[PDB]
Symmetry: D2
Subunit: 322 residues, 4 copies
């Protein structure tokens, strides 16, 4: 489909239904040790190393209009992250997918955030032999879709800053391609953005290149060509979809080092994430990005990204059995 | 007191009593939302941001022979960490101390690990206003004292490596003076040490200086003078005690940049932490440190550190009301 | 003495004399292999490794009103730099000083820049044994005093930027306490400043701290206290003099890490260098520093720094034998 | 042609002729301000900013058996380097090539090192307007071919270390794709290698990846595939030739991040540079690389690289007019 008005109008209709629901799972549901629990009642062991040392990876696919979006790509990224961390998925994929679809169906949520967390488990790495660290724990939950930029704001764009008081954790400390919850730097960025009268922090690599922000990748558009950092960042599924969309809409996209100066020269800027989709930035460091309006290439990408949510290649329909 | 044999003999006697205990709190006790729970049964909310984004600081004081060691120094460090993170202790100090002493007394544990965790709470920073982030959560627990180096090994020293596949998260990403559970780099170090046939990883700053390791600070001893990194590291309470001990035993200690080459030139090497105390390193990168035996200055520090546990200035006695 | 008007008026009088001189050495004189040459005619061997690989250290003391300022401090810093580089001064100190004073006297220059360069010599390090690298070369020259900020501008202050396209070479690559001519980053900073409509670049360490700029150290003044970076920078003789001046004028000065945010919060900012002295900064990133006027503590330091040029403790008089 | 014995035998014959030459240019010739001078007599102005602030780029093509090797690739790299530095070639390309060929012919040198240096000139960047910095200086010289690894050693391989006391200057300080003479870190590496009983330092990026060394790129060979760092390094013409050679000999080569651990796992290691060609490394950190012998893929590359020196696509013949 894909115009802003159409995509958001459908969401608003579905949200109206969900907000009126008497289902105790309408606010979300968690899977904890084989049992489904309302999300706000869910609890995990204090001694889980996902809490004790954030010793975990995670991933967040999504459901849009009752259709899982690029689920296999998320599951493959999670499996790759687990392998890099010497973790292993505690359930085989068919059981993971059956469980997730059951949770979503039970909740009635049509536009959902769908998180999976794999932790080291109850035995810490420090002082253990490798064979003592194989009993890894899985937590999964769904909740209503979350917006890093609200729909109304996507029409006019948001306010970003290039963070100056913090830089991204370097890959030689923590590999940013391993999706993780060690957000110390990203939280510093969020506070700095708020202190500076903005919402979205763009972090550098401490070597004068752009990386990513607090829950999103960044794409610059300059003289008809798209640019996004290669290193120092999560290889986002939304970013992958932007690369797909650029090729399909017929634009060049370059995944390479992006010197931070390029941010100040950009014709258009957008953020991309599962938690909100395609999120234009129209003010940077208190100055407008070009004319301060959402750009034409941004809009082409926006439309294509959303159109993909109803295509077989990128999505599948959940049966809500209602 | 302070000889290895004496200190460890007392611990073994107290451990023998604890291991025979029928008290359901002998394996530890947690405080969760005002209620005491056996440690292995304790659970926290899934949505706590201490789990969802490791958005927390913590601290770990200890009890030795029924005496809290440097509790105020730990509580002041935790309060300073909270302030740096824009967190606040959810209970006033008198209530914190009363609760901790009650937990320890109830458990009967004489040699204890005593952890306090302050998290952002149930509302995430991303998308919040600062005034929405003030309802911070506190978790506290005690467990039997944990050894990063077992007593028997402290007689002969351990095996370390200088990590080559990972470096410490830089302070411009996460301030290492804020004690935290974002251990991605330290866990990489632990796996690298195990892969290389060692136990203790020393991480560099990625600029050819020594920092700290996975749960400890590092001190080098060279030509009668002690050296420990100033930047890039937690300002350990054990390290503070080593500085106190050095001054009292009459040695110079220098808290300054320590180029990594110094590790290879050291006369003695020790690690220091609340979880084990003073832990000699006698093999580095598969080669002996000097003669490969625990050094004389290390032993002087070891003895003084433990002697401090029975001095008023540094400790207070808990009434177990038994 | 020390008011701006008085100090600059004396310089202008002496400059008027020098500008009228018919002495062929009035524009400067070089010492090359034991011979004095007019500066603009001086030549060095192409194969000198100071040119072939910038394999050198240098230092620049100065003469003010016919008085060498802190010459021994410069010579001791040069000797320390040589030792760090495994170079050695090719002439003993008495011969160095006799030669420099003779050059200055011969030139008639009363306000002089006085440079010494020690290079590896004609044999490169690559492919040599250490004993083949001991024949180091010395070049010395004097020229009329050079202003990084012109006298008239010192009344109102200059325009700085925090560089965003470059960061300072880290000490684990090149030790910035070794004064050196490998200015690749500082030249990038200069071009960035010019591109951004400013004159003075302040470089960060790539970890969100202030370092130094292109030929100067940086001092911030905040709530009556002075602050200057400890690491990542040359330990300037002017900076040393500012520390002396602060203590004498009775202010606290802290030589420690300076987060870059502090630059944006400063009450006053100044740059310091032998090539110009004490140089106020009153615009930063296109915004005024406080009221955009030269601050009171800056002026106290300015006056004291210049007063030192006529004190025995810090200077000696050259006999021009005229 | 291309076997070691054949290639080196031809060089030895030509060297025998050159060593007997009575030509005053047989030891090299420099071009300085339009005049040819014997290399050991050549001198440059002291005030040239190539000396005063190493404010220059350079390049070093070569002549082998009287044939210039990949001259245009070197000249294009030099032109790109100049553009990045806001320098410009002071002579048009036809004059550069005519001059270089004349110098080589006059010298009689058949196997030559051929250096070009472009400096900022006599006006320093600091304190200048951009339009005052356009009078750039050119120096060119030829000298007999220089070996970073002597021919006899290439049969058995050399000794390398991974540097631990220094790391490569990061690209956000100085762009390593701009060939430059600011060798502070590389000289530290050379001294560290010598201190550790080795000849060749491999520097990391300070983030646990391999970069390059003191005058060479590094290629690892693992399970039939070649690997060489993408970032942090000069894009060597020899490296380009190795990429060409790998494709022609039919091997995969990957130009990507190379974690430093890979060096310790490699089947074969080689260094590559114009100053010596293809230089096997058979000892790393005092341990043999696999069997400690020169590997089969290294030999295939070695042969192909040298074969290219007699092919039209990659070389042209100089007329010595003898
Ligand atoms: C650091 C970072 N970088 C990039 C992205 C975008 O990645 P995807 O295009 O694959 O979503 C993210 C997004 N991470 C993310 C996505 C959806 C939900 C949540 C949540 O837990 O609130 C987090 C992120 O956290
Ligand atoms: C990174 C790091 N650095 C230094 C220390 C030593 O700090 P103290 O001297 O203040 O203890 C630590 C120690 N951190 C620590 C101490 C005691 C117990 C536990 C645990 O949770 O297992 C962790 C640490 O984790
Ligand atoms: C990088 C850097 N940092 C600090 C200073 C100030 O140091 P002193 O306070 O010791 O001068 C410098 C100054 N370096 C300097 C000083 C005087 C003349 C020249 C020249 O060669 O033009 C260079 C410098 O080049
Ligand atoms: C840092 C660095 N990296 C890689 C190379 C290899 O680049 P080429 O494959 O393009 O040559 C170099 C080599 N640089 C080089 C090459 C030839 C001679 C000289 C000299 O001046 O002694 C220096 C170098 O100095």
């Amino acid at each position: 489909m894909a115009t802003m008005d159409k995509v958001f109008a459908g969401y608003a209709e579905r949200q109206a239904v969900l907000e009126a629901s008497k289902n105790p799972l309408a606010k979300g549901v968690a899977w904890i040790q084989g049992e489904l629990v309302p999300l706000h009642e869910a609890r995990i062991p204090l001694l889980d190393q996902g809490f004790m040392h954030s010793d975990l990876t995670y991933d967040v696919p999504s459901v849009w209009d009752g259709r899982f979006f690029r689920l296999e790509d998320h599951l493959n990224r999670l499996e790759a992250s687990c392998k890099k961390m010497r973790l292993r998925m505690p359930l085989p994929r068919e059981e993971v997918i059956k469980t997730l679809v059951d949770m979503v169906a039970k909740s009635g949520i049509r536009d959902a955030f769908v998180e999976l967390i794999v932790t080291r488990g109850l035995t810490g790495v420090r002082g253990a032999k490798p064979e003592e660290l194989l009993n890894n724990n899985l937590y999964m939950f769904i909740q209503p879709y979350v917006w890093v930029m609200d729909p109304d704001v996507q029409y006019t764009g948001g306010r970003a800053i290039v963070a100056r008081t913090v830089r991204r954790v370097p890959p030689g400390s923590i590999d940013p391609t391993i999706k993780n919850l060690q957000w110390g730097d990203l939280v510093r960025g969020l506070f700095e953005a708020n202190d500076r009268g903005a919402t979205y922090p763009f972090l550098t690599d401490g070597d004068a290149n752009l990386t990513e922000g607090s829950g999103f990748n960044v794409v610059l558009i300059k003289d008809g060509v798209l640019y996004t950092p290669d290193r120092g960042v999560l290889q986002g599924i939304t970013r992958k979809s932007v690369i797909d969309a650029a090729r399909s809409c017929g634009y060049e996209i370059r995944v390479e080092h992006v010197p931070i100066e390029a941010t100040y020269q950009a014709d258009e800027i957008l953020m991309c994430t599962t938690a909100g989709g395609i999120m234009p930035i129209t003010t940077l460091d208190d100055k407008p990005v070009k004319d301060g309006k959402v750009g034409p290439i941004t809009k082409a990408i926006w439309d294509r990204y959303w159109a993909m949510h109803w295509e077989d290649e990128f999505s599948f329909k959940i049966n809500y059995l209602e």
